[PDB]
């Protein structure tokens, strides 16, 4: 019904996607050799979104990896993959995987914007598969360089993806330094955090809830004009080891750790900017009165920092299955005109990409 083809591009995209598969095989309950272990009936309900089976029930993910490669197979869930998808002819394997699908919903891409692989190979991959399949949504998780290469990829990315997020690894360091109290933040913990927030927007696909919202509902509900699709992720219930039982896991605390600034995943202060639109997809057992109240109380009191000409900036989606251990969790995606603060820093550091970035920044500027 709604299947997702996963694309890993570049060096860091391979790690981000591999540990996304860590998480997705974890809370679906999938044995690393391929098989499923059996407790519930909600885990094996919508595995066609991300997995297709081999004989004997061994589920292999619908992922093709293109760039390091030997280090992925040495990982925990490194043997979950089919060996023929180690493409290092990418168009051939992705079109075979799309042909075997029932009815494709879109593509998932993990790559970087600060090298010759994610920006060079991956953006050409997007340009090819968008031209082949123009009636789907291009979900691209992009790691951006710190504002404090990138130009040559964004000017062709704007025409293609219609759905993209900036990661801003210094904001992940800000998370793990300020709001987590972890003395030794591995790269693994950082992109574990981004995998946890990236599996947080595809929850309605795989689990039933009370207000379902696929990736296309988000695409129509946070894109008002066909080029402004630069978002700003988040993931609220993150607390320190010494503040574990000091938390009342309620909707109020989750809302506050949504709309705070340090929890967000961009190196931009949202006060110069204004939130064009907001989507806060909720996971677990929330009473809808509480989500309903705190998804507009922030709008009512913080009105000088929300955009006019939209009577309702927010979007609410609620599932019924939380992640492991936690009981209530939720994920932020949002369009803000503070995204251009990164691009003003990038533009100061051939001609058509510079001109396109300037026009995009001016386009984000006039709505503010």
């Amino acid at each position: 019904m709604r299947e997702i083809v996963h694309l890993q591009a570049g060096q860091c995209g391979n790690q981000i996607g591999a540990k996304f598969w860590e998480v997705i095989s974890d809370e679906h309950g999938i044995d690393p050799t391929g098989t499923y272990h059996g407790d519930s009936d909600l885990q094996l309900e919508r595995i066609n979104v991300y997995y297709n089976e081999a004989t004997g029930g061994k589920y292999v993910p619908r992922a093709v990896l293109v760039d390091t490669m030997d280090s992925v197979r040495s990982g925990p869930f490194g043997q979950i993959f089919r060996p023929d998808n180690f493409v290092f002819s990418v168009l051939d394997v992705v079109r075979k995987e799309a042909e075997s699908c029932d009815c494709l919903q879109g593509f998932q891409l993990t790559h970087s914007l600060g090298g010759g692989t994610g920006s060079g190979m991956g953006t050409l991959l997007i340009s090819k598969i968008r031209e082949e399949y123009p009636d789907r949504i291009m979900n691209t998780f992009s790691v951006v360089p710190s504002p404090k290469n990138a130009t040559l990829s964004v000017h062709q990315l704007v025409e293609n993806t219609d759905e993209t997020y900036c990661i801003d690894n210094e904001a992940l360091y800000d998370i793990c330094f300020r709001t987590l109290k972890l003395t030794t933040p591995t790269y693994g913990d950082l992109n574990h955090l981004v995998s946890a927030t990236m599996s947080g927007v595809t929850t309605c696909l795989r689990f039933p809830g009370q207000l379902n919202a696929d990736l296309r509902k988000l695409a129509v509900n946070m894109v008002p004009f066909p080029r402004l699709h630069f978002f700003m992720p988040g993931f609220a219930p993150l607390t320190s080891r010494g503040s574990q039982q000091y938390r009342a896991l309620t909707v109020p605390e989750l809302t506050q750790q949504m709309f705070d600034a340090k929890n967000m995943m961009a190196a931009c202060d949202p006060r110069h900017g204004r939130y064009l639109t907001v989507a806060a997809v909720f996971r677990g057992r929330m009473s809808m009165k509480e989500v309903d109240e705190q998804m507009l109380n922030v709008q009512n009191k913080n009105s000088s920092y929300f955009v006019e000409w939209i009577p309702n900036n927010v979007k609410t989606a609620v599932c019924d299955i939380p992640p492991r251990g936690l009981k209530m969790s939720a994920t932020f995606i949002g369009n803000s005109t503070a995204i251009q603060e990164l691009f003003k820093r990038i533009s100061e550091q051939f001609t058509e990409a510079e001109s396109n970035m300037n026009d995009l920044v001016s386009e984000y500027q006039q709505y503010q």
């Binding site: 506050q256 709309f259 705070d260 600034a261 340090k262 929890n263 202060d269 913080n302």
Partner: peptide
């Protein structure tokens, strides 16, 4: 809010 230095 939660600001940036706060």
């Amino acid at each position: 809010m939660a600001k940036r230095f706060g």
